[PDB]
């Protein structure tokens, strides 16, 4: 029971990683819905660096092969009320992403579901007892609108739409 992501070019199996964190943007403007919406960051490398949880691998939207938090999910932002500040999310338990060589990298649906649920709970501590929705990247250059990463000198691009499209109540 997997989330199987389409990636271009095909990442070989030894470019499989552990997802150890990710970076969000909270969607702005008024909602009379009691929802808070998050998308993969609309920032850039500077926001990724500021999280200080990357390892050696350079990647967008997801931190791959980075540091893990000690007990539970950790979220941090320079200013929670400012939708132009990215939100850093550090996992306590990593989620393996296994690439086949044949053009996809897959993750366990149940593990990603439980990850999003934990993240959503920490976000609820920060913005209130609200419904939490993850929605796809709002857009950007190819390396940032995709989950993209450098493996061994080659750049890979995984559509992350499946990872960020769900409601958490």
């Amino acid at each position: 029971d997997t989330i199987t992501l389409p990636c271009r070019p095909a990442p070989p199996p030894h470019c499989s990683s552990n997802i150890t964190g990710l970076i969000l943007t909270r969607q702005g403007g008024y909602s009379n819905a009691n929802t808070v919406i998050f998308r993969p960051s609309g920032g850039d490398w500077r926001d990724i660096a500021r999280c200080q949880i990357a390892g050696t691998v350079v990647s967008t939207q997801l931190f791959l092969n980075g540091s893990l938090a000690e007990e539970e999910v950790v979220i941090r932002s320079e200013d929670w009320r400012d939708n132009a500040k990215s939100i850093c999310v550090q996992l306590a338990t990593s989620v393996e992403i296994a690439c086949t060589g044949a053009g996809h990298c897959a993750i366990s649906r149940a593990k990603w579901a439980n990850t999003l649920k934990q993240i959503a709970s920490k976000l609820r501590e920060q913005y209130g007892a609200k419904t939490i929705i993850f929605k796809p990247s709002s857009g950007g250059d190819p390396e940032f609108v995709n989950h993209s990463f450098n493996c061994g000198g080659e750049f890979f691009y995984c559509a992350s739409t499946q990872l960020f499209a769900s409601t958490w109540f």
Partner: antibody
Amino acid sequence: QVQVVQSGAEVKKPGASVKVSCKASGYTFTDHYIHWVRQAPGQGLEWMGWINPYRGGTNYAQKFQGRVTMTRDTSINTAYMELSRLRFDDTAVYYCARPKDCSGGSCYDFDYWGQGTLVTVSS
Amino acid sequence: NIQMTQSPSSLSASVGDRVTITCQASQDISNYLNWYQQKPGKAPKLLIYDASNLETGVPSRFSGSGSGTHFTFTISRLQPEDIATYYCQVYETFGQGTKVEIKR
């Protein structure tokens, strides 16, 4: 010195779309987000969203999601706002706004504004 | 999210006296409130930023103060060229504005 110049006024038909340009100069284009804020005639100010010109990221106000697209061309320091499926109450003066350096600063203290672009929605 | 309440919606004053405008924030926003002056037909103009600081080139009769949820914008001695609508702003939210007009 810093300048922010917008395209000229337009009329567009209901259901059609408009694209407004915002050309900046006199600073490092990729160092500041560009925000769009609009003002219906004799009304208040309404924020529409921001674009990150460095890598193209955006964050649109929820009420315009699915109807607006913000882009930029770094080679000519120009940001664009495209609003589609225009309704009558989209008639308004559309401003681009540039905040102070978005790192450390709020990225919401709008130092410089364009002159505005009146978009009239009418047949 | 963050609501704003700006007061009064319009005031009329004689030249030279003191004008005070308030903005009440829905939640603690620290000192991240800005104040803009908008003349008819013109873009808004930044006067006060981060609730206290005077934008460079702004005359010193314009002041702002406050923190948390209650903020104050004041013109010490209203000048003729100060006719405008004034807005506070917290992040993407703008207050309703205050049209100051002169009595003569």
